[PDB]
Structure 1
């Protein structure tokens, strides 16, 4: 039984890249997948993507460029206490100057840098670099 619909969307994207592909079908999409897809895109880590409407849960086609090393999900959505954000980025980003911890907060799904700027925190979704 599909536990995380996000998890299947990231690992799909990840396996595409690793195999040199330029697109992936993903299934079944969600509000959360879209927003996560949206953040990566805003930052160049993927191209455009299309939501196809099966009369169901959705499918998505992502077009990816090849700037992407890894997009991972964080399996329990642990609470982060805004000061703990440093400890996450460090644990799991390649350097202090690029890459993002993306996470869910009362003020929207946003990467940690926007989170820092907006001075909000919340729970941790996953990451890109």
Structure 2
């Protein structure tokens, strides 16, 4: 089966961005996807993206910016206990300096810097660097 759509989508992104396609298509297209992408937009790893409504399921067209390096997804959505964020981001992203860890939470879908300001953690989805 097609399991984690988010992953299965971000995989296409990661393939697209690897070759230098200026865009990608993403079949299934969720809230999470869009709130994940929305996050990439707010930092700037991603251009426009255009959610098609198949009178049906979803479908997205992303515009890549040549800025994504990796559009990570961590797989069993591990629960994170606020301090353990530091151990995830340390182990996933290059450097204390720059990068983001896209985590769903009580607050919605933040990145790990926004989630530290708020003082609210939860599950992880993926990351970007």
**Normalised by the shorter chain, which TM-score bucket?**
over 0.9
SS in 1 for 2:46: coil
State the 1:97 CA deviation.
0.9
SS in 1 for 2:83: coil
Mapped partners of 1:116, 1:83: distance in 2:
9
Report Cα offsets for 1:36-63 as digits up to 9, x if no partner.
Answer: 0100111110101000110111100000
SS in 2 for 1:50: strand
SS in 1 for 2:54: coil
SS in 2 for 1:124: coil
State the 1:20 CA deviation.
1.1
Q: Who is 1:35 aligned against?
A: 35
SS in 2 for 1:123: coil
Q: Which runs of 5+ in 1 are unaligned?
A: none
Number of residue equivalences: 129
What is the aligned-residue RMSD (CA, Å)?
0.6
Q: Which runs of 5+ in 2 are unaligned?
A: none
Task: Give TM-score, length-normalised by structure 1.
Answer: 0.98
Runs of 4+ more than 4 Å apart: none
Report Cα offsets for 1:45-93 as digits up to 9, x if no partner.
Answer: 0101000110111100000110111001110000000010000000010
SS in 1 for 2:124: strand
